Design an enzyme around this catalytic site. Structure first.
Site, mmCIF file in Angstrom:
data_model
loop_
_atom_site.group_PDB
_atom_site.id
_atom_site.type_symbol
_atom_site.label_atom_id
_atom_site.label_comp_id
_atom_site.label_asym_id
_atom_site.label_seq_id
_atom_site.Cartn_x
_atom_site.Cartn_y
_atom_site.Cartn_z
ATOM 1 N N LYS A 287 3.857 -11.425 -10.573
ATOM 2 C CA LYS A 287 2.892 -11.247 -9.513
ATOM 3 C C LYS A 287 1.759 -10.321 -9.996
ATOM 4 O O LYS A 287 1.931 -9.074 -10.010
ATOM 5 C CB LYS A 287 3.589 -10.571 -8.323
ATOM 6 C CG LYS A 287 4.467 -11.457 -7.494
ATOM 7 C CD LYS A 287 5.362 -10.683 -6.523
ATOM 8 C CE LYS A 287 6.064 -11.696 -5.656
ATOM 9 N NZ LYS A 287 7.121 -11.156 -4.701
ATOM 10 N N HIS B 259 11.758 -13.379 6.398
ATOM 11 C CA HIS B 259 10.742 -14.432 6.622
ATOM 12 C C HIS B 259 10.946 -15.284 7.885
ATOM 13 O O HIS B 259 10.220 -16.276 8.090
ATOM 14 C CB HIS B 259 10.635 -15.364 5.403
ATOM 15 C CG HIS B 259 9.972 -14.731 4.221
ATOM 16 N ND1 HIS B 259 9.542 -15.458 3.130
ATOM 17 C CD2 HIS B 259 9.669 -13.433 3.960
ATOM 18 C CE1 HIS B 259 9.019 -14.631 2.239
ATOM 19 N NE2 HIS B 259 9.082 -13.397 2.720
ATOM 20 N N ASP C 139 12.736 -10.133 -9.132
ATOM 21 C CA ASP C 139 11.488 -9.946 -8.421
ATOM 22 C C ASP C 139 11.392 -8.444 -8.113
ATOM 23 O O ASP C 139 10.755 -7.690 -8.854
ATOM 24 C CB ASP C 139 11.494 -10.852 -7.178
ATOM 25 C CG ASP C 139 10.292 -10.630 -6.220
ATOM 26 O OD1 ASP C 139 9.268 -10.040 -6.626
ATOM 27 O OD2 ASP C 139 10.397 -11.078 -5.031
ATOM 28 N N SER D 122 0.816 -1.185 0.000
ATOM 29 C CA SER D 122 0.000 0.000 0.000
ATOM 30 C C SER D 122 0.867 1.259 0.000
ATOM 31 O O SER D 122 0.352 2.368 -0.114
ATOM 32 C CB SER D 122 -0.897 -0.014 1.225
ATOM 33 O OG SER D 122 -0.112 0.171 2.380
ATOM 34 N N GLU E 295 17.025 -15.807 -7.320
ATOM 35 C CA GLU E 295 16.178 -14.625 -7.401
ATOM 36 C C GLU E 295 16.706 -13.495 -6.513
ATOM 37 O O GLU E 295 17.104 -13.727 -5.336
ATOM 38 C CB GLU E 295 14.739 -15.014 -6.997
ATOM 39 C CG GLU E 295 13.736 -13.842 -6.713
ATOM 40 C CD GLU E 295 12.347 -14.338 -6.287
ATOM 41 O OE1 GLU E 295 11.983 -15.493 -6.659
ATOM 42 O OE2 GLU E 295 11.623 -13.574 -5.589
ATOM 43 N N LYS F 212 5.808 -20.443 -8.769
ATOM 44 C CA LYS F 212 6.278 -20.336 -7.403
ATOM 45 C C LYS F 212 5.039 -20.103 -6.553
ATOM 46 O O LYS F 212 4.408 -18.991 -6.567
ATOM 47 C CB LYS F 212 7.299 -19.188 -7.204
ATOM 48 C CG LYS F 212 7.900 -19.140 -5.772
ATOM 49 C CD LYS F 212 9.102 -18.191 -5.620
ATOM 50 C CE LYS F 212 8.681 -16.820 -5.234
ATOM 51 N NZ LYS F 212 9.860 -15.951 -4.942
ATOM 52 N N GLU G 249 4.238 -19.279 4.044
ATOM 53 C CA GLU G 249 4.129 -20.009 2.776
ATOM 54 C C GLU G 249 4.163 -21.507 2.956
ATOM 55 O O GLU G 249 4.234 -22.254 1.975
ATOM 56 C CB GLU G 249 5.218 -19.586 1.798
ATOM 57 C CG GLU G 249 5.122 -18.150 1.445
ATOM 58 C CD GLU G 249 6.230 -17.660 0.528
ATOM 59 O OE1 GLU G 249 7.049 -18.485 0.039
ATOM 60 O OE2 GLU G 249 6.229 -16.413 0.268
ATOM 61 N N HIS H 153 2.938 -16.592 -6.391
ATOM 62 C CA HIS H 153 2.070 -16.282 -5.279
ATOM 63 C C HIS H 153 2.563 -15.026 -4.555
ATOM 64 O O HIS H 153 3.599 -14.486 -4.895
ATOM 65 C CB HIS H 153 1.952 -17.442 -4.279
ATOM 66 C CG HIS H 153 3.232 -17.796 -3.569
ATOM 67 N ND1 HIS H 153 3.306 -18.798 -2.620
ATOM 68 C CD2 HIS H 153 4.499 -17.328 -3.712
ATOM 69 C CE1 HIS H 153 4.542 -18.879 -2.158
ATOM 70 N NE2 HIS H 153 5.293 -18.009 -2.818
ATOM 71 N N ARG H 154 1.769 -14.580 -3.583
ATOM 72 C CA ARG H 154 2.210 -13.609 -2.606
ATOM 73 C C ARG H 154 2.240 -14.275 -1.205
ATOM 74 O O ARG H 154 1.694 -15.351 -1.021
ATOM 75 C CB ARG H 154 1.275 -12.395 -2.599
ATOM 76 C CG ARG H 154 1.079 -11.667 -3.944
ATOM 77 C CD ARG H 154 2.415 -11.166 -4.538
ATOM 78 N NE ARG H 154 3.146 -10.245 -3.688
ATOM 79 C CZ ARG H 154 3.077 -8.908 -3.770
ATOM 80 N NH1 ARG H 154 2.245 -8.291 -4.605
ATOM 81 N NH2 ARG H 154 3.813 -8.179 -2.963
ATOM 82 N N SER H 155 2.879 -13.604 -0.238
ATOM 83 C CA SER H 155 2.859 -13.979 1.181
ATOM 84 C C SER H 155 1.450 -14.156 1.741
ATOM 85 O O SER H 155 1.145 -15.186 2.357
ATOM 86 C CB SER H 155 3.578 -12.906 1.991
ATOM 87 O OG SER H 155 4.930 -12.951 1.650
ATOM 88 N N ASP I 12 15.603 -17.677 -3.301
ATOM 89 C CA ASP I 12 15.346 -16.229 -3.310
ATOM 90 C C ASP I 12 16.193 -15.590 -2.221
ATOM 91 O O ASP I 12 15.980 -15.799 -1.025
ATOM 92 C CB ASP I 12 13.874 -15.895 -3.106
ATOM 93 C CG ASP I 12 13.580 -14.387 -3.227
ATOM 94 O OD1 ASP I 12 14.491 -13.578 -3.551
ATOM 95 O OD2 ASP I 12 12.391 -14.011 -3.067
ATOM 96 N N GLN J 293 16.158 -15.592 1.921
ATOM 97 C CA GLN J 293 14.754 -15.610 2.307
ATOM 98 C C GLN J 293 14.103 -16.944 2.023
ATOM 99 O O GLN J 293 13.421 -17.469 2.885
ATOM 100 C CB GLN J 293 14.027 -14.462 1.593
ATOM 101 C CG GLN J 293 12.513 -14.286 1.869
ATOM 102 C CD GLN J 293 11.984 -13.078 1.142
ATOM 103 O OE1 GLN J 293 11.339 -13.194 0.091
ATOM 104 N NE2 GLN J 293 12.339 -11.892 1.637
ATOM 105 N N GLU J 294 14.280 -17.502 0.828
ATOM 106 C CA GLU J 294 13.556 -18.729 0.428
ATOM 107 C C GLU J 294 14.503 -19.817 -0.082
ATOM 108 O O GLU J 294 15.324 -19.550 -0.946
ATOM 109 C CB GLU J 294 12.511 -18.414 -0.675
ATOM 110 C CG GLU J 294 11.649 -17.195 -0.384
ATOM 111 C CD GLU J 294 10.713 -16.744 -1.540
ATOM 112 O OE1 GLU J 294 10.564 -17.457 -2.567
ATOM 113 O OE2 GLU J 294 10.141 -15.629 -1.408
#
Ligand SMILES: [Mg+2]
Ligand SMILES: [Mg+2]
Ligand SMILES: [Mg+2]
Ligand SMILES: [Mg+2]
Lengths: 415, 415, 415, 415
Positions: free
Chosen positions: B333, B155, B308, B43, B281, B384, B205, B361-363, B240, B163-164
């Protein structure tokens, strides 16, 4: 017959723990399709309806290919051409074809998926929501959810003996405002945990499993989150003790003690005097018949006492419980019994004899929100469908938010 | 116009983390209905399409009532009567109605949902699956999933920088068998963690966040679990790094060091020499343009390098990247860019210029499986969409298992 | 809205006693038509929903041309274009249009007919029986009837104080056999009366009003006929005392005496000890609150205690009765409350709080069998719809015989 | 054939006296459904078509299970696939299949049900009212009712010999106003009997059976009520003497005497001189042929003389009556003859030969109002369907009140 079953199929999909389960799809003669995903249950045991598992090299013995076969071959052959709209005939046909008293032949994972899928297909063909198909214009009440946000027992690896610690939002005049309060309280709990160095990672139902000291700490934590969120006195506590998990040799082993039935009862009286507990599930063990009788006398007029393992959604077992005055509420787990009709029977029995029904999820759920419609269809007034996170739980709440635009009745604190 | 848009509405539902998000529903002039739920976005920020949040007392600032009002009033008024089948005109109308270059009027959570819901409604009117509506008879490729089963960085709260940590089942001729492998490896990992005194509770996730020492311990664990499962050489590793999260003063702060861009690249060369990493990523920061050029020269021919944060699903930003030879792949995304058409434009640009697309996807996800069909529609060849648990993730895998009954082409290792 | 209400009208018809009442007809936008005839109620009173009567020179002041005009002009104007399938919005709209707490504007005879007719029209449009429209696949129980075959009190000119003496066929596994038993008992009663020189002519509900000596002679005669017919132990007795009719100056004037509330309760204890009486309706007066609390303490665990005048089908009055522990059952007279939704609310409240519901006729009935479908829709388990003669009574029994071909569940003596 | 008969069934329901009768249901190949309930007739006799009765332990020997079976098996098997709209072919096929001259095989209760049900199903398929199906646009005349409000003879147990004492409202320009006059007169009669100590309980057709002294006292009472109600000269008196009931050994046993035929005729002459009797049914017995010839010569140009038992709705018997100059009117009881086409044949014969037709009820009726449509279809101009009370009677009046909104033609006193 207005429409008949034209095709039925099943295949393997994944549940919310990553184990296989059954999805079924039924097509009617007008081309209307309905489908449904069965949550995971139990493949052994002498009380429950059994789900078929393959026990081979795939998915750690948890494949559902035989369940799937039983739908595509045995059930298909038996139900094609039956009246789409006679749910009772379809369900009784499934029971008769299985020929056992616990679906040990077809598997409850085969029968429930087909049972739910047919109902959805029927509702689709009429252009009607599922809850209206199942419960007519009388289907009205949005259920008060009990939301399991702190876990212990076998559901964790901590020192908490009780399995589920839940919040229940009664002090509201709309379901959405009720749902908002539990969402806000959960967010606050997450923060409280993070800030005291606990994990914010989630268990199977979306709740947290911090290593707390005993069974009262989690309650204290709920109380302070309820108060910080600004909902004091409007949100109450419900417990699932799952006492069968620690009942051995006539004694309940918890809080470093060996408790008698009567002593555990006194413990619940104590807890109920100090905290706003409105409900307790499986406070005594599934075969402690004498204890339950005492439990219900002492607290049955003060709080809700829910049989889960005691009744296993089974009409006959619930009947004997009603007669002998055990409990005053029953958890409803449709896959535990195997068809929608048999689920309805158990609910109707309970509601004719002053037992409240809690429409329930399983640990292994799916994206399928059947039980949100079912709870409204039968005016259960209560639902147990997880914490306020994980899509297989939030799918149910979202469904209920949808149904709320069409029927917005929420009892809250009203009789 | 064959059919036209007859009704548009939205309401607040919950995403998979318990935050509000938008569900939209579009009804066409034949009565066909389509609905979609939007995953959570940003946002604030100066690059990405923005989602609107209410920032009031509800849901900790995260209500979406303004977005929902934007669908019910502003968008509805504009799109009622438009040709149901002209997706491009719908999406272009949304962009124009919004009038900004980042949806900071309508909000991308308002526009995506309507964009998605209209597509589902058009596919339903035609009796066609979504993926056929989006990509026709040329929709064919079931994508290879990259599955985030161990977490670090932002995360989790460990000493892990990246992160991933993902596994990718290349060595298979069917999607069903590819998916089985990652499910089996996930179950084995769950058991290894439990026996080694780690929590088996899940991150957003569906992956685990153990308090591991460094960035290679997680890889070693994946390797052990791959081999123990019996899929050595058939499953590769993707990462990622989300390196923007530790980029400060021109240096990358990881492994108790301060790396230059050059040093971080040679670290990736090392890692890739030792382990079967096929994809990395955001190896470098979203604004380290010189670094990306060098990284792409250095490894771009050996491994997949995904933008990303570098590209944010944005066609213009991607165009410049192609021109400057940064990366060779783009994470897609849809809610980052705000309509299906704008998403398809970014994919088409990438695919015309030898960049692979990873549908993402998103979180904060939902039970909506749109991205599964979208991945097949556009023949992305990769997706993903999370670990193999939590319904908002398993819904996508399940939808892919359904699509496989109609199109079963899995490339795996094939060109 | 799928279908909308396209036309509403009404006209004067005759009830089963030769007085006017309202027939309503509702047409939907697919052309489907539903019609319903309202039973007659009360145009005065402080508690009940009022029916509008004209009070002119026609029909001895009992014309319903104003009720009829309220449907044709005021209601029509308001409900045209409303969603056919939203019963609750229809009924809430009728309540709001009225504006009072007792339908003293529109008249309950105007609103109930339209309420019922819309439900029949929606059911016809879906090709669905009314009971499935109202209660879905869950509509199942065929009720045990209570059949008023001997009359006294205000329903006669004799020495008998009690108003209705009824037989209830519990000891059967099917509705049809239960119904045959009461028809057989009724024919035998007729012969017994004729052989003793009594009249075999009928009162309003199809029963006989012989000039018997007291309140126990009619019961003795029911037992004799039960036994000669061959159904000893299988048919029980129910009573409607209608005690408000002989309550004056804080005492009950019957059997040549003036009873206190307490003394009258003791007469019911004696009666119940001597005869198989399972149910007593309005054992105490509609305003004798302290007596009802006592009666319910004394007998409420042993026999059904039905409030008729006590509750007048009113949810708010019933709710106070629940809280004050008065009665354990409620007579349900839809026209007393004015809409099908308000009827369902009163029934749901009752069934959530361990009160049994008896779906009931009025003295002035019609050929309309709505209350048969309604009893099954809501699984009331009981119905009071008259003796086994006069077409306005037999139409309901016949409807239940038709429903039995689709759902045959008859509980009888089962829990 | 536009549509054909696709399904035929029957089942047992209850008539208005509480005895079994047949309900038949017919479904066409468009799915249109028609249903009909047969009134009760005679299982024995040598003149009437016979109804089949079971004669076993059920319902005092009055079960109709054999009739029902004859519909579900023999008839069904013969008429499935016949043109839905060829009423004459259906009815001739029934007569042929039966193969007797009096339906002693299939039973008139089996065949009439099917006959009426098919007609209703054809009307429904066309979207037309039954009276239009049967009589076309020429179907117009709302009948003048003859309303049996005081009973004697075999219909009571008094000292009154004649069976039915009826009022007929000729002096009105609308049916509704005529119907209102008779309702108001009936209400005044009820009060008069209650104030002079007589019972107000009802006989089978809804009239009263007070113990009056002779056959003129009832007429005197009717005149008083007509005048008190304000309808003097506008309402006339019709009688059914049912003289066959008291005819024995050549003479008519009434009022303590044995009357010759000629003396009974002179009694009618006296009665018609003194009171406004406009019609007499069965003034002489069913085999008193010479008597009927003299009665017809004497009073046939002054008053209506209706054959009931004389003609039994039978075309051949009426034809001989016409030839021999017996009676000037015929009572029409469809179940007496066994099909709609045969009923129609009898009415057309009569209307060609200046015989008036009175469409008639039976004493065992149902909620089915077929005969109201039938009266209007055939422009009979007269109907006999009971007192202004009891649902099986008022259902017909109500149906005529409905038809009056589409065709309001009422002859009353006009030629
Ligand atoms: Mg439990
Ligand atoms: Mg990333
Ligand atoms: Mg009463
Ligand atoms: Mg006669």
């Amino acid at each position: 017959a207005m429409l008949v079953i034209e095709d039925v199929r099943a295949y393997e999909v994944l549940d919310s723990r990553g184990n296989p389960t059954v999805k079924a799809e039924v097509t009617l003669s007008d081309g209307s399709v309905g489908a449904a995903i069965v949550p995971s249950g139990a493949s052994t045991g002498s009380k429950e309806a059994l789900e078929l598992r393959d026990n081979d090299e795939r998915f750690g013995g948890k494949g559902v290919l035989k369940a799937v076969a039983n739908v595509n071959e045995t059930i298909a052959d038996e139900i094609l051409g039956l009246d789409a709209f006679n749910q009772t005939q379809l369900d009784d046909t499934l029971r008769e074809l299985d020929g056992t008293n616990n679906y040990s032949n077809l598997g409850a994972n085969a029968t429930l998926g087909v049972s739910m899928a047919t109902a959805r297909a029927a509702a689709a063909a009429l252009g009607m929501p599922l809850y209206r198909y199942l419960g007519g214009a009388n289907a009205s009440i949005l259920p008060v959810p009990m939301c399991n946000i702190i876990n212990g027992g076998a559901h964790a690896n901590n020192n908490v003996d009780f399995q589920e610690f839940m919040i229940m939002p009664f002090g509201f005049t709309s379901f959405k405002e009720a749902l908002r309060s539990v969402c806000e309280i959960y967010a606050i709990l997450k923060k409280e945990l993070a800030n005291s160095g606990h994990s914010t990672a989630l268990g199977d139902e979306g709740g947290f499993a911090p290593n707390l000291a005993n069974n009262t700490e989690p309650i204290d934590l709920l109380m302070t989150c309820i108060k910080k969120a600004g909902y004091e006195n409007r949100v109450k506590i419900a417990l699932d003790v799952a006492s069968t998990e620690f009942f051995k040799d006539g004694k309940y082993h918890m809080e470093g003690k060996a408790f008698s039935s009567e002593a555990l009862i006194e413990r619940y009286v104590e807890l109920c005097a100090k905290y706003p507990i409105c409900s307790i599930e499986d406070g005594l063990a599934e075969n402690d018949f004498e204890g339950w009788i005492k439990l219900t006398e002492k607290l049955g007029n003060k709080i809700q006492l829910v049989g889960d393992d005691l009744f296993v959604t089974n009409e006959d077992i619930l009947r004997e419980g009603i007669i002998k005055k055990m409990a005053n509420a029953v958890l409803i787990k449709p896959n535990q019994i195997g068809t929608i009709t048999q689920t309805m029977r158990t609910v109707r029995l309970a509601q004719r004899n002053n037992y409240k029904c809690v429409m329930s999820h399983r640990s292994g759920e799916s994206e399928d929100a059947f039980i949100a419609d079912f709870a409204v269809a039968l005016n259960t007034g209560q639902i147990k469908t997880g914490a306020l996170a994980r899509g297989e739980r939030t799918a149910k709440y979202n469904r209920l938010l949808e149904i709320e635009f069409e029927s917005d009745e929420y009892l809250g604190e009203k009789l």
